[model samples]
Target chain A: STQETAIGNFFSRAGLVSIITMPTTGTQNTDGYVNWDIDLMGYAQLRRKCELFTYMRFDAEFTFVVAKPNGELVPQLLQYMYVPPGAPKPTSRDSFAWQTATNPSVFVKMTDPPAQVSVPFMSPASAYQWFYDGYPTQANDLDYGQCPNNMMGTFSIRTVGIEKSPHSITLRVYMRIKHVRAWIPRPLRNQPYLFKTNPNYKGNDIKCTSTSRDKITTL
Target chain B: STQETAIGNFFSRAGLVSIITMPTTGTQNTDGYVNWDIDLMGYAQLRRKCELFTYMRFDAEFTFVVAKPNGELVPQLLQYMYVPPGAPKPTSRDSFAWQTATNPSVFVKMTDPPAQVSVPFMSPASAYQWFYDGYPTQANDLDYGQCPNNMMGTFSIRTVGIEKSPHSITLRVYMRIKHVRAWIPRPLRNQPYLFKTNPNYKGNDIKCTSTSRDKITTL
Candidate 1:
């Protein structure tokens, strides 16, 4: 808190609370075929570039490959999350949000799945939904003595009907980042601060993030 | 509360708290084949038999149907619960209990499914665990100001290995009940108290419960 993050408090015994980045509780219902876990493939570049006053812009897209091993058309229920940059980040306890978030892990009755595209039979993310950029910065942490805010806001969608276990859905996140101008009192701006919450901060380094995924069929 | 269950004190403004019986939160992962949700089929007897100074005795058992559609030998993970009469009731927050309770609804990953039988391959509830008998009484209610206690106490068992979705588990609860001789002031003994928590009391009636089940697919 104010004690541990304080630059000169040698008697700072109150440790900073552990910040939650990704949730580890609840149940992940997605299994067997599709890989639903996030892949920060950009961590390589992110590790080298992100350390300063920066924010990331995010865009998301998905591919639904609906077919049987025999290459026959198969309809399946598709459920997943997306970053609609401007709307409110969903609450975990909220049932609608809970279903989508957990469907990737824990099974909740998916109420609002994405609609089927041309599907003569199968479905896809065929709807037109535009979302601006999600500035992924600890805006709050940037406050004087800032803290890491990993409350990455997200919303999910599901397709109609029951999705058989034969289908695969791949969702990818793309990002771009830039450093913002830092206005400081000169002294603190020049000083290095080690933060328990802000682990990637190095006074004046830049950071970024992105996604990558894989498949499990015919595996 | 001081209001609803109160006999008089008409000026009492507080309402009684809602007594929780079976929980509706979290998730139940048990699916398609086995019916794990409690079949209060005995609600019939319990409906007719319980009311006054009576408590029920509980014992639990399960029948694991292990085989493929062609009657081929298939091994499976059998997870379920039972009443070990005297042990402390489990807390919903406890991870062990959380997994078992949710496996039937919300999947939390079962760490303790029951053990295997002598098939050398197929597992079953083959351990010798004795529970004297749970006195299913709102013992607290008999305390002059007693209430209904549906917090049935139970512990689950999971067979070793991942049982393919082909296995079906049927758990049944058996119960017996009797009225304890009431010791009370002659005045109160002759009176009936209406309680929001105590839904079955009718001056001096009796209550009981038992188990019944059905099959699926083979439908």
Candidate 2:
């Protein structure tokens, strides 16, 4: 397995990196204070049958301009969902509204703070705060297939702070797509297996198969 | 995510690839006819603290001589275990006798055929019979982590059917190791997170950390 692609930096209309001047006024949307829309490969575009298990690893960081804001760090939502092949892709800011409004395959939330205070990084401004996102639903196992075209579509990274910040904050996040295992009902090789000989054997005839890269062909 | 390393072909004493004559009779061990011993990197060898999820992928095939054997095909056992690092490494063929005796994290068994007869390929003997190994234990999801060094150890590949065959079997297999995710108590970045400012802020203090590539340094 190798890294397929990555989306990093606070993306802007210009490119993958950007600078945000937190809009302190009434700038909160249905999601939160900051809503960054995301787009990437679907199951087919990435590798098809080659990759049955896929994941997005997150590496992020941020720095405050003047102060750390009322809530040093706040709630943030990084969620994604699969789009049916023929379905319409998101175009507007609220395009992913419906998907985010409910359930999505990829959804990790950075929770809220108890009480708010405009605290600056002082007490050993030496320390660093961080966040991690994982499959919350899978308790004993983190089995989330961001693969299966049925599980890929739109992605959004939303945050719920800085609206009350007195200064701007610069942030950067590097997200990558990785594949581990392939799906069941495994894919067939260029040369395939015929699973039915005569008396129904997993040996002599073709019961099911995957070929042409990622698509499956049944006999 | 990248390929850690790979083992291909029929690994002989010289290296990773070799030809097998498939010893005919009197060669059946407790496992089966052919027993191929295997060893590779453990959890610490690849990348500690770095990979929480790991896997080994298998692509295998074989060709028969003038005759395709009585059953044309047979059973195979590819199993593995995690040696506690301090435990002795398997030195002899039966070194894994104890481990295979119980349950191993990595164990996939290829079953046996019914009343058999060595049928020479004639009519569409043109077909190829194949085998697939998956996480039979994981019901809803394929959640087998040959990761967790606690799950790494000696590996063995055993086979049946070849014992009764008149002609030898030629086989080759390609196996690759890959990583997808990390375990819980995610590793900290080169720079880390402090989750307690005073009243335990997931922001200001260090609860757990992964540093120096794979080691987890806890607080």
Candidate 3:
């Protein structure tokens, strides 16, 4: 019971906090795997206490083996990160850029990463697809970072001949939250955390509103 | 050149006797993320130095949310352990087992601490799966002591509702690497990590007959 108190108190200290990276928290599902759910209420409460507002993005890295003792190719090691409910899914371009950066570990001498030759299989992001925005009679924004970014980014390290058991492979992962570059400075009239009512809109309508107070206390 | 040399030095220091966990070294990939390649030469070299082995197996944990905001429902937080190649996938029964331990937080109350629940999705445990053996298999083998085991075990923390930032969720994970349980108790005889020569015949193979006298370490 006291453990919960300590967790809450720790967050109340206020800061952008990162918990220790955990390898396995629970069991794989009946399907033999578990997905990342970023918006668990427990997390939200902690964020609120920490005064740490959030942004969205997902990333992953996998180190697989192209060869084994038997000369068999396999994806032996892997790491993955995913988006939460409040974050935007990755766009196709994000996927491309991420792949371009991560695929060289396996056939290290290869000049090209696998992502360069292959493309994601999905619908491009559509600003006017299923929303009330309706269809635009003009050219669409199909370049990059414009549409649904669900499968937009991934990086992998493909090992050559590593095996499991007796021997182990380790991978580290970093999840850099993608945030809209803010135009305004720190203090705002209303709370910045309350910018939009929509849970999904990260930077929407986040214009800098003027504040009229000198109640700021220097901490 | 200096940077590469430094990296090499770092690998030498941590490579042979540690389970190094960190983030993706470089960028993302086309698969929308990065994964580990257990076959990387550097990793292979590290394993050889340790004389350790890897396998896929079922890893399970019982979990529950300890705290929540007022009136907020707990989102389903999934957790998964590694399943090695050529092992059965996990069923809800095999992987997840929840038991109410303790959470002193007064704000939240879970009537069923170990309720029947499902995690968000299945994630890949690249490193965990690499060192462990046989996906979805019984994880009871990972106990601290062989017969009369100690109270030490592995546990991880994960959730979907963590703040949109990686820094938002506060998780704690602990793992035990039983070096004594290596697949090949002796590697000086040039025994492979796993003796595939006779998968069914376990007694007289690598463990019993390895003339190497080197110890096989398991993560």
Model 2 lDDT tens row, A1-219:
132331222121122222232333445433232433222222223222222233222222221121123434332222223232334544443353423212222222223111111212221212221111333245332333222222222223332121222333333322332221222333323333222111113445544444344445543
Worst 10 residues of 2 chain B by lDDT: B62-71
TM-score of candidate 1 to 2 decimals: 0.20
What is the fnat score of candidate 2? 0.00
DockQ of each candidate's interface versus the true one? 0.01, 0.01, 0.02
Kindly list the per-residue Cα lDDT of model 1 for residues B87-142, writing each as its tens digit. 33333323354344333321122112212221111112322111112342444434
lDDT of 2 by residue, B1-219 (tens): 133231222121111122223434445433233333322221122222222223222222221111112112223443333333324544443454435434233344322111111112211222211111333244343333222222223333333223333433333322222222222333323323222111113455545443344446543
Q: Rank the candidates by TM-score, best first.
A: 1, 3, 2
Each model's lDDT comes to 0.28, 0.28, 0.26
Model 1 chain A worst lDDT run, 10 consecutive residues? A115-124
